[PDB]
Amino acid sequence: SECVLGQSKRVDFCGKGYHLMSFPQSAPHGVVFLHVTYVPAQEKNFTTAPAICHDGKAHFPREGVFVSNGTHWFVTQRNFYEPQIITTDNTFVSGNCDVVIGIVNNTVYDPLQPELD
Amino acid sequence: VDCTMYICGDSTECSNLLLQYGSFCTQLNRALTGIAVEQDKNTQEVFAQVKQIYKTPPIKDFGGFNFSQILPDPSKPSKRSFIEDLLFNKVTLADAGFIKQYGDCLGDIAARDLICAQKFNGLTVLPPLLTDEMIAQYTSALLAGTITSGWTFGAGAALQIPFAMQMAYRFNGIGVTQNVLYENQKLIANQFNSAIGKIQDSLSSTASALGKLQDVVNQNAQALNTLVKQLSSNFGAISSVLNDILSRLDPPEAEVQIDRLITGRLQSLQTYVTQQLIRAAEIRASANLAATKMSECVLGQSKRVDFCGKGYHLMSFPQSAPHGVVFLHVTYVPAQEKNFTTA
Amino acid sequence: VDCTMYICGDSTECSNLLLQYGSFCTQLNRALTGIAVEQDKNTQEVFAQ
Amino acid sequence: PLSETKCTLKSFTVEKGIYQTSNFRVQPTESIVRFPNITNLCPFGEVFNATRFASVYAWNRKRISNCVADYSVLYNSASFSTFKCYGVSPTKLNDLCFTNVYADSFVIRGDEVRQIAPGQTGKIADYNYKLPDDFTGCVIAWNSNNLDSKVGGNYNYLYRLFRKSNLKPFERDISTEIYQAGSTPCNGVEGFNCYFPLQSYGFQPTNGVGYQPYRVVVLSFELLHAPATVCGPKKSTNLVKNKCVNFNFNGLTGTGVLTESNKKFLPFQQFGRDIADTTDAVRDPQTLEILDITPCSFGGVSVITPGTNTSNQVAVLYQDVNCTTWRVYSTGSNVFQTRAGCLIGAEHVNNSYECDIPIGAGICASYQTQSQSIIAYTMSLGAENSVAYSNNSIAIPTNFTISVTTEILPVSMTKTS
Ligand SMILES: *[C@@H]1O[C@H](CO)[C@@H](O[C@@H]2O[C@H](CO)[C@@H](O)[C@H](O)[C@H]2NC(C)=O)[C@H](O)[C@H]1NC(C)=O
Ligand SMILES: *[C@@H]1O[C@H](CO)[C@@H](O[C@@H]2O[C@H](CO)[C@@H](O)[C@H](O)[C@H]2NC(C)=O)[C@H](O)[C@H]1NC(C)=O
Ligand SMILES: *[C@@H]1O[C@H](CO)[C@@H](O[C@@H]2O[C@H](CO)[C@@H](O)[C@H](O)[C@H]2NC(C)=O)[C@H](O)[C@H]1NC(C)=O
Ligand SMILES: *[C@@H]1O[C@H](CO)[C@@H](O[C@@H]2O[C@H](CO)[C@@H](O)[C@H](O)[C@H]2NC(C)=O)[C@H](O)[C@H]1NC(C)=O
Ligand SMILES: *[C@@H]1O[C@H](CO)[C@@H](O[C@@H]2O[C@H](CO)[C@@H](O)[C@H](O)[C@H]2NC(C)=O)[C@H](O)[C@H]1NC(C)=O
Ligand SMILES: *[C@@H]1O[C@H](CO)[C@@H](O[C@@H]2O[C@H](CO)[C@@H](O)[C@H](O)[C@H]2NC(C)=O)[C@H](O)[C@H]1NC(C)=O
Ligand SMILES: *[C@@H]1O[C@H](CO)[C@@H](O[C@@H]2O[C@H](CO)[C@@H](O)[C@H](O)[C@H]2NC(C)=O)[C@H](O)[C@H]1NC(C)=O
Ligand SMILES: *[C@@H]1O[C@H](CO)[C@@H](O[C@@H]2O[C@H](CO)[C@@H](O)[C@H](O)[C@H]2NC(C)=O)[C@H](O)[C@H]1NC(C)=O
Ligand SMILES: *[C@@H]1O[C@H](CO)[C@@H](O[C@@H]2O[C@H](CO)[C@@H](O)[C@H](O)[C@H]2NC(C)=O)[C@H](O)[C@H]1NC(C)=O
Ligand SMILES: *[C@@H]1O[C@H](CO)[C@@H](O[C@@H]2O[C@H](CO)[C@@H](O)[C@H](O)[C@H]2NC(C)=O)[C@H](O)[C@H]1NC(C)=O
Ligand SMILES: CCCCC/C=C/C/C=C/CCCCCCCC(=O)O
Ligand SMILES: *[C@@H]1O[C@H](CO)[C@@H](O)[C@H](O)[C@H]1NC(C)=O
């Protein structure tokens, strides 16, 4: 019921990896399952920070992590690298730059002001 | 069980009679062997979930968090953590090392030492496949895994993440914005460190929490001591001692008395095996649950409300103990509520 | 179970013979007692949360 | 040990694995027989050759002590039509010592011999002489029709005919108080409904067999639970310490190793007992030393077997030895000591590998080329790895693999009836 009729989120159910789907097959005196899982691959190490300091306000990723290469900061989802420009749509604003430990300085892009200009 | 020693220890006439009633002696051992194998499988299922034995990182900058009582203590010859050392010291095993030499029991002492008395009647104890040091290496790997990689140390290659970020994501999992962790990072680290210190002192002071592991040990010891005590029963015989029967009676009369004792002795052994087998089913159920909790509380973040302790599950760390696993479950519990108007 | 009553209820000669075969009578009760305790624990675990 | 595995499994083929076998045993090498050094022969000439026997009415009870019960001395001239032992098989009388030995002695009518046995009723069993339900001795009797008989009758033998109740085991009553019958008060005078309780026997030489006199001797004795001074004719030997021996101590036989003990028995205690009522100490009958007795067998053995369809080499694990003579079946050139015991026959290597044929306590074994042998090794735990954990570094996947794995779960058993 939990692997075939639905999608289990239990880490040790339906095989190793993130459960994606499954298909039952019968056998004498029992059941054999084919469990389809998703396993991440080919990771790379990037620089990271818990928040970005813009104008003194602290910006936290709405989802994902703030990650960077040697020249630019991007926001990505956790399980598959896909850098996106950090904009005001992808972030929460709270607190300030004097509170978050490890905060870094990186301009956050305003998607609307340039259209209005 | 050496089912011949228990029935006809050092007695030729009894031993030969026992051959006719021999299929039963073999059957008892087959059941016990199956149990013995299952017990190593249970240990492996609970702890051997990691094939990559990760070393404790050289960097201890886990934000403001401590964890030194949880991680292996390098000053010891063993790889036990401070908390594990306490757990091992409180659960009492009848003995250790599994070797008693014949010469060590060659005297009056054999009747005072219950382990020796069990051996002389054919009852033995087999060592576990995994040793405490090997288990400590497995718990070490699990801790290195969750301290540095968290969720992804399993379900794929381990990826590193800063510790504070790892918890930030665990807070989003609970349903609290990540902003809380960073703004209150010092508070959170201090509450965590204090909680671990309280556990350490609690375990040092009161051992009653560990009664469950002590009970497993005591129950098996009693079952074996019971088998020795039941040897004294006559079971309808003139005497419980084969030597009294054989000295006073000729063969055809002795055979009646011996057969009564043989049947009775098998009855005691069958009772023993059945009780061990039922208990084995119970220990397996516990082991399966323990394995599930290991994977769902340590290798991932369970959202089941009654798993990983009370409160919202945030993270956990396993520790080993004789005959079992002890978990430290870290949960988030809300406090100091106020009532507001709502719509 | 009163394992003496079940075997030698109201009988002196039987009761004395039963003493030799006595470790078994005690063992039966130990198992039943353990079950009886577990049954209250089961009730408490399900409802006393 | 490999053959022991094959017999246990009822097979000529054994699969690779670990099999358990019988605890290591040794055999006894010599037999020790110890009895007190009694030189006097028992008074067979007084018990069975008396000029006069007591009547059953007032039977005699002779105490016998400090003698050798060599009953073969009776074979040259005694003849016994009746002989039965209750507490011991008669073939064992010569290997035992007896204690508290008494010989009851009396004359009865031949048809009454059958009433002596325990559980019987009749005028003798109920009013003159009764054995207990659990009598542990021997009853012997013979036809003295040329000794206790007289031409005009022998009126010196009496039996009790009237009593108001039955006797308890081994009681005597020589009272002549007149018996009152029929609820008819009697002041000591024979008459209507008042009887002298005793009557005489005839025993004329011309009577048929049921009326001939018989001499009965009952030998009452106890075995194996006390010091004993009446003992059979078996010769003693010297006592040998600290070896596996067979033994006989005053009739108590068994095997084991005799060692000196620090136990101190009270003056009346001959044997001790352990927690399960097995003798574990004795007092030697000639020199009063207390010896402990331990079993000869002890230990535990298991056999490490490559499949027999591949190789006949095995390694044997001994659980109770240190190996640093030895309680082993044999000693080879390859001896490895571990926490699980002494492993003999397997080579040891300093490598580590995946487990097969598990031994215990960190040790596993396998059959390998380099020309092949059994190898003992420690277990690996997967492989070592590490993480960087820089406090500002994150690893992020850039690709993925979708994989499919299988899992098998039994659902049902064969149904039977
Ligand atoms: C992450 O960066 C490190 C370098 O900072 C890469 O190299 C390994 O770093 C670890 C930790 O100090 C060492 O133990 C290894 O020996 C280094 N590898 C080699 C070949 O020298 C590491 O490979 C990077 N991670 C990823 C996914 O690329
Ligand atoms: C970090 O990633 C950015 C985005 O992909 C890279 O920036 C671009 O690099 C290409 C050359 O490969 C240029 O033609 C583009 O104009 C650059 N874009 C911007 C906005 O400058 C950047 O080079 C990467 N940095 C490092 C150190 O690898
Ligand atoms: C991560 O660790 C590094 C050290 O390995 C920390 O670096 C320090 O940064 C401060 C400025 O904030 C400097 O004054 C110190 O001199 C640096 N230390 C060293 C040894 O160079 C860094 O701040 C840490 N970051 C977080 C978020 O904890
Ligand atoms: C982000 O930029 C601000 C400046 O806008 C940096 O703050 C200055 O730091 C220097 C060196 O410590 C001080 O002398 C100045 O007085 C600070 N200025 C202000 C307005 O506070 C800040 O350190 C930068 N942050 C990071 C993470 O690089
Ligand atoms: C984790 O807590 C332990 C105490 O349980 C800290 O170790 C103590 O450090 C003080 C100095 O500040 C010494 O005087 C004590 O003797 C140490 N005690 C022990 C048992 O070692 C340890 O430094 C803390 N680690 C972190 C990262 O906070
Ligand atoms: C939340 O509660 C904690 C205590 O549970 C408060 O922290 C303590 O504050 C007092 C001063 O009032 C200090 O003396 C203690 O040392 C602090 N404890 C710790 C572990 O740091 C905290 O201030 C409260 N926060 C809010 C928003 O009410
Ligand atoms: C919520 O508001 C109530 C008042 O409306 C607070 O006071 C309690 O209210 C309950 C419900 O009527 C009574 O049974 C209690 O006796 C009241 N307490 C006292 C001390 O009189 C209540 O404390 C408020 N909740 C919170 C979290 O502040
Ligand atoms: C009981 O008495 C008889 C005699 O009535 C003994 O038997 C005689 O023994 C001597 C010496 O060995 C022989 O010369 C006689 O021929 C035997 N007589 C008969 C009739 O056989 C007998 O030994 C005595 N028994 C015991 C135990 O003392
Ligand atoms: C032992 O002595 C008692 C006491 O004299 C006997 O019991 C009595 O027997 C007479 C008949 O002979 C009865 O009238 C009395 O009423 C009995 N008295 C009691 C107290 O029971 C007893 O029978 C004797 N035991 C034996 C084996 O003869
Ligand atoms: C076999 O016996 C030896 C002793 O002859 C044991 O080795 C000793 O172990 C103690 C610690 O318990 C050390 O202090 C001694 O120095 C050791 N002596 C020697 C000669 O090595 C050995 O442990 C026993 N083997 C097993 C498996 O228990
Ligand atoms: C005809 C009688 C009524 C039948 C009912 C059953 C009665 C049981 C009694 C049987 C008689 C037993 C006599 C035992 C011999 C005594 C001889 C002796 O000691 O000298
Ligand atoms: C004879 O008996 C005495 C007393 O029990 C004993 O001390 C002595 O050794 C015995 N002797 C032998 C067989 O010479």
Residue numbers in the entry:
A (entry chain A): 1030 to 1146
B (entry chain C): 736 to 1078
C (entry chain B): 736 to 784
D (entry chain A): 295 to 618, 632 to 677, 689 to 735
What does the published report state?
The FL spikes, expressed and purified from insect cells, were formulated in 0.01% (v/v) polysorbate 80 (PS 80) detergent. We next performed single-particle cryo–electron microscopy (cryo-EM) on the spike formulated in PS 80 detergent. Our final atomic model contains residues 14 to 1146 with breaks only in the flexible loop (619 to 631) and the cleavage site (678 to 688). The S1 NTD rotated ~14° relative to published models, whereas the CTD and subdomains showed minor local rearrangements. In our 3Q-2P-FL structure, we observed a shift in residues flanking the 615 to 635 loop, resulting in a salt bridge between residue D614 on one protomer and K854 on a neighboring protomer. This observation is particularly notable given the increased prevalence of D614→G (D614G) mutation in the emerging SARS-CoV-2 strains and its potential role in viral transmission and pathogenesis. The first density was buried within a hydrophobic pocket of the CTD. The location of the PS 80 ligand provides a possible explanation for the S1 shift seen in our FL trimer density. PS 80 is specific to the formulation of the Novavax 3Q-2P-FL immunogen, but other ligands may also bind this pocket and provide a potential target for drug design against SARS-CoV-2.
The SARS-CoV-2 spike (S) trimeric glycoprotein is a focus of vaccine development because it is the primary target of host immune defenses. Like other type 1 fusion proteins, the SARS-CoV-2 S prefusion trimer is metastable and undergoes structural rearrangement from a prefusion to a postfusion conformation upon S-protein receptor binding and cleavage. Here, we describe the structure of a leading SARS-CoV-2 S vaccine candidate (NVAX-CoV2373) based on a full-length (FL) S, residues 1 to 1273, which includes the transmembrane (TM) and the cytoplasmic tail (CT). The final construct, SARS-CoV-2-3Q-2P, was also modified at the S1/S2 polybasic cleavage site from RRAR to QQAQ to render it protease resistant, along with two proline substitutions at residues K986 and V987 in the S2 fusion machinery core for enhanced stability.
